């Protein structure tokens, strides 16, 4: 366990103890209020790798819902076809889901839609896992959101026994195998992340996954949570590192100089303030933050020439 | 009657007593073993250049040992590896034989589809079906008895879905009353019933923009074709259908050997091949394509012989 990832190629480049590297958020577009064009993500894709950022991110959503107040639904496209199309259009840099809904996706699928990803892009696939809350996805494929909880235990479970046994026997409420086998199998094991709760308690996703992923919170706010986590993942698993992960959105003023300001699941700021921010995240014991451009006032591709020519040199690629 | 007039992928596959040529995944002579999956985008690649119509793959989750199939259909996930072998060719058509409707929920397919349609537009054939994999049913919980039912059910809940705004859908699947699927397909996406899947004919008459069957010899399969049609003829007057056929294929060093059965196909040199194909093209099957996993020789070799000497004989439309 302690030697988990030792040879994992996206893993490694992506986390280590007390580093911080850096991500981006498909759609790599400032559409804010309004639907995403979904224009350039490929070219954004690849300068984003091309300026040392470590993950590219994607959602888990099928429907546009009027209620839920998400104007990109997702990335418009289908997650693990979308990216597919964007993971074949570049030669390191990782891609993860933020998050695959196991309450949603039947645990064998996603086992097989996983690893043949890996096969595909070995070592460069990031598996961020949830319970789900787009209820109109619930709705649609009749799922019911108040036993997620339940389901997604139950499914985490068919999901690590299927990727990596040979012909398991398993008996659950989601299906059953006996005298089956999955194939591909990923080369090697593929980090799996928690995502929020994910209805859990705090215990469950220490002991489970292989890492946690949380919401935007202020530096203060995240410090103990990290804390109190990382004490029962030593409880559980002595001397294991286990990453933290989260998202950001950011608004990054054409003034340099511009003081911080919080926005909604973020800031508002210049980039010298930028920086002194994730020094702080990373301080606070943040291992990857992914950037989310969707509302700021400067177009994504301006924006992402100044990160990755003025702050990636200071979090850079491991 | 106009419904596919300025798809590009239909046009170049399919046209009333026309034959066009495709290629099944993994092209690869892997017979009794696993393939290797090596050089298959090359493959594709030249598949393409070649002037082949389509490439073909399979939906199948598990490797189970007492189905007989060595590949488990090709190892990787189809939706997947199309969207993979799809994002390194330019314009060949990329086809599902068959997407299981009974196993894979209808708004997924429908997401996957749509997102696959906007990608590479009009390059995405919907072959569909009921699916026999008993396996898969086991591991995803569904019932292999029952899904014929649950096939007439998605492939309503697909439909509407795919192609309406906001729709309403009320089904033993979900319901959507509200919400609204992005993306959108640009065009229809011509669908094809497979097999029976567990219907009459009666039934995929009126249902899909075409049919795809097993492989039978002509004259064992030239009665189906004109029955189905003569129904076809029935519900929608002077709309064309196609027909699609897989056959297996084990093609001869020598051009002049007669055809010999294999499972599935035929041994036979190029010659009687081609005699054979026009065979087919007379009893009404608009697109066939060539299995190679149980041929002698190594694909790339016969991929080659077919493009050089068999292709110009039933080009791209």
Same mark, same amino acid.
């Given at each position: 366990?302690?030697?988990?990832?030792?040879?994992?190629?996206?893993?490694?480049?992506?986390?280590?103890?007390?580093?911080?590297?850096?991500?981006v958020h498909i759609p790599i577009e400032n559409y804010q209020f309004h639907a995403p064009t979904m224009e350039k993500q490929v070219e954004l894709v690849q300068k984003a790798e091309q300026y040392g950022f470590t993950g590219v991110?994607?959602?888990?959503?099928?429907?546009?819902?009027?209620?839920?107040?998400?104007?990109?639904?997702?990335?418009?496209?289908?997650?693990?076809?979308?990216?597919?199309?964007?993971?074949?259009?570049? +030669?390191?840099? /990782?891609?993860?889901?933020?998050?695959?809904?196991?309450?949603? %996706?039947? $645990?064998?699928?996603? *086992?097989?839609? =996983?690893?043949?990803?890996?096969?595909?892009?070995?070592?460069?696939?990031?598996?961020?896992?949830?319970?789900?809350?787009?209820?109109?996805?619930?709705?649609?494929?009749?799922?019911?959101?108040?036993?997620?909880?339940?389901?997604?235990?139950?499914?985490?479970?068919?999901?690590?026994?299927?990727?990596?046994?040979?012909?398991?026997?398993?008996?659950?409420?989601?299906?059953?195998?006996?005298?089956?086998?999955?194939?591909?199998?990923?080369?090697?094991?593929?980090?799996?992340?928690?995502?929020?709760?994910?209805?859990?308690?705090? +215990?469950?996703? /220490?002991?489970?996954?292989?890492?946690?992923?949380?919401?935007? %919170?202020? $530096?203060?706010?995240? *410090?103990?949570? =990290?804390?109190?986590?990382?004490?029962?993942?030593?409880?559980?698993?002595?001397?294991?590192?286990?990453?933290?992960?989260?998202?950001?959105?950011?608004?990054?003023?054409?003034?340099?100089?511009?003081?911080?300001?919080?926005?909604?699941?973020?800031?508002?700021?210049?980039?010298?303030?930028?920086?002194?921010?994730?020094?702080?995240?990373?301080?606070?014991?943040?291992?990857?933050?992914?950037?989310?451009?969707?509302?700021?006032?400067?177009?994504?591709?301006?924006?992402?020439?100044?990160?990755?020519?003025?702050?990636?040199?200071?979090?850079?690629?491991?």
């Amino acid at each position: 366990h302690m030697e988990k990832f030792a040879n994992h190629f996206g893993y490694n480049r992506m986390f280590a103890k007390d580093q911080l590297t850096l991500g981006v958020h498909i759609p790599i577009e400032n559409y804010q209020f309004h639907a995403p064009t979904m224009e350039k993500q490929v070219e954004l894709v690849q300068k984003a790798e091309q300026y040392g950022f470590t993950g590219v991110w994607l959602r888990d959503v099928l429907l546009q819902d009027p209620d839920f107040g998400d104007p990109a639904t997702g990335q418009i496209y289908d997650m693990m076809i979308y990216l597919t199309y964007l993971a074949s259009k570049t +030669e390191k840099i /990782a891609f993860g889901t933020s998050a695959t809904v196991l309450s949603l %996706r039947h $645990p064998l699928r996603v *086992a097989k839609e =996983i690893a043949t990803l890996d096969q595909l892009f070995p070592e460069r696939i990031m598996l961020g896992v949830s319970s789900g809350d787009r209820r109109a996805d619930f709705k649609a494929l009749g799922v019911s959101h108040e036993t997620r909880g339940e389901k997604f235990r139950e499914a985490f479970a068919y999901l690590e026994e299927i990727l990596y046994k040979n012909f398991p026997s398993i008996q659950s409420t989601l299906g059953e195998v006996h005298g089956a086998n999955l194939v591909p199998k990923p080369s090697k094991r593929v980090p799996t992340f928690i995502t929020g709760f994910s209805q859990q308690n705090m +215990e469950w996703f /220490a002991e489970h996954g292989d890492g946690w992923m949380y919401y935007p %919170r202020s $530096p203060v706010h995240q *410090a103990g949570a =990290i804390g109190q986590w990382r004490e029962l993942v030593e409880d559980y698993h002595p001397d294991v590192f286990k990453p933290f992960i989260q998202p950001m959105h950011l608004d990054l003023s054409e003034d340099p100089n511009e003081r911080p300001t919080p926005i909604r699941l973020g800031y508002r700021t210049g980039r010298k303030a930028l920086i002194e921010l994730l020094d702080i995240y990373k301080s606070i014991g943040v291992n990857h933050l992914f950037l989310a451009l969707f509302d700021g006032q400067r177009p994504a591709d301006e924006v992402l020439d100044e990160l990755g020519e003025e702050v990636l040199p200071h979090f850079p690629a491991l």
